[PDB]
Amino acid sequence: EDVVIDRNLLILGKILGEGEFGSVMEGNLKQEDGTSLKVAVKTMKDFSHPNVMRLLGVCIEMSSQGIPKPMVILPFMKYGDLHTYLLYSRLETGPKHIPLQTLLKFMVDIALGMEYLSNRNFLHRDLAARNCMLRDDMTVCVADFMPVKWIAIETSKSDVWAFGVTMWEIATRGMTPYPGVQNHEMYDYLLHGHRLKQPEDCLDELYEIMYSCWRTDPLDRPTFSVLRLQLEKLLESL
Ligand SMILES: CS(=O)(=O)N1CCO[C@H](c2csc(-c3ccccc3NC(=O)c3ncc[nH]3)n2)C1
């Protein structure tokens, strides 16, 4: 409760995306040095890591009737969510052919972020490419801490499952998981040992890593620190 920002230091602009509890808006935050910073405002503070969304602060606006309007202030992510970015990469006017190297680097960043959170025994519970945001340096961070296709059958090993699905989203550059399978069918599909199929031109080594995330027994799944190194090692071999 010393995380608060004076509401007068904040100017709210147009809507950036729509969130669980309300709109996410662009804003300008006047900082302690007198300068103004572009921010995102949703209408965590202990976390410090480059691949994890930092909290800048909180403002409570007073409505006209006096009902609280709490707002969460986050850094501005020029390139928006990773899911949308991948989709745009498949179009001429959006970003170029993203090579394999850049796709793995997105995976490594996310693994680094999740390694940090899992080490502090913090569960994400909603990890997906749409919840991974892109910084202006094009490094990815993790954000947004019940979409059936990211949930594991049965902990941090649930998060590991979702990260594997996220790796698949990245490898496919934005395909919805499990084409030709409905949401109500998912439990039976998985219970019979079926998993996300290997993407088209994607290396066997990469597919082994993502597959290890979906082992039936969560104790057979690797930790985030194991995954991170496996991904780093794969990247270095290209
Ligand atoms: C995953 S989430 O919980 O962060 N979330 C949930 C609601 O939709 C938001 C969203 C979607 S596309 C977008 C965006 C698009 C262009 C430029 C900047 C943008 N956002 C940010 O800079 C920003 N920073 C912190 C949160 N959002 N924002 C993101």
Tell me: is residue 41 an annotated ligand-binding position. no
Tell me: is residue 158 an annotated ligand-binding position. no
Tell me: is residue 32 an annotated ligand-binding position. no
Q: Which of 46, 81, 109, 126 is catalytic?
A: 126
Token pair for 15: 């809507």
Determination technique for this entry: X-ray
Beta bridge partners of 26: 40
Q: What residues contact 3, with CB distance under 8 A and at least 6 apart?
A: 45, 55, 57, 58
Token pair for 48: 């410090």
Q: Is the dihedral of CA 217, 220, 224, 230 positive or negative?
A: negative
Rounded to whole angstroms, the Cα distance separating 169 from 84 reads 11
CB–CB of 142/132 below 8 Å? yes
CB–CB of 90/207 below 8 Å? no
Residue-level length of the chain: 238
Reported structure resolution in angstroms:
2.2
| Residue 161: closest CA among 177, 181, 139, 145 | 177
Breaks after residues in the chain, judged by C–N over 2.5 Å: 43, 145, 154
Rounded to whole angstroms, the Cα distance separating 79 from 188 reads 37
- Buried b / exposed e over 130-163, threshold 16 CB at 10 Å, is bbbbbbeeebbbbbbeeeeebbbeeebbbbbbbb
Q: Where in the chain is the domain with CATH 1.10.510.10?
A: 77-236
Tell me: is residue 21 an annotated ligand-binding position. yes
Residue 184, classified by CB atoms within 10 Å of its CB into exposed (0-12), middle (13-18) or buried (19+), is exposed
| Residue 150: closest CA among 140, 160, 141 | 160
The number of beta carbons lying within 10 Å of the beta carbon of residue 39 is 22
Rounded to whole angstroms, the Cα distance separating 79 from 98 reads 14
Token pair for 220: 């057979």
Binding-site residues, ligand 1, Cβ < 6 A: 16-17, 19, 24, 40, 74, 76-77, 80-81, 131, 133, 143-144
Token pair for 31: 């900082």
Q: Is the dihedral of CA 196, 199, 205, 206 positive or negative?
A: negative
Residue 82, classified by CB atoms within 10 Å of its CB into exposed (0-12), middle (13-18) or buried (19+), is buried
Rounded to whole angstroms, the Cα distance separating 12 from 27 reads 4
CB–CB of 179/194 below 8 Å? no
**Which one of 24, 85, 132 would you pick to mutate in the ligand 1 pocket, going by the greatest count of ligand atoms within 8 A of its CB?**
24
| Residue 49: closest CA among 145, 165, 153, 173 | 145
Residue with tokens 């409760």: 1
Q: Is 159 tagged catalytic?
A: no
Which fold does the domain 77-236 belong to in CATH? Transferase(Phosphotransferase); domain 1 (1.10.510)
Ligand 1 mean position, distance from CA 25 (Å)? 8
Token pair for 238: 């290209």
The secondary structure of the chain, three-state, reads: CCCECCHHHEEEEEEEEECCCCEEEEEEEECCCCCEEEEEEECCCCCCCCCECCCCEEEEEECCCCCEEEEEEEECCCCCEHHHHHHHHCCCCCCCCCCHHHHHHHHHHHHHHHHHHHHCCCCCCCCCHHHEEECCCCCEEECCCCCHHHCCCCCHHHHHHHHHHHHHHHHHCCCCCCCCCCCCCHHHHHHCCCCCCCCCCCCHHHHHHHHHCCCCCHHHCCCHHHHHHHHHHHHHCC
Nearest atom (ligand 1) to Cα of 130: 1
Rounded to whole angstroms, the Cα distance separating 52 from 144 reads 10
Nearest atom (ligand 1) to Cα of 76: 22
| Residue 147: closest CA among 122, 132, 130 | 130
CB–CB of 86/129 below 8 Å? yes
| Residue 170: closest CA among 85, 238, 111, 64 | 85
Residue with tokens 């296709």: 149
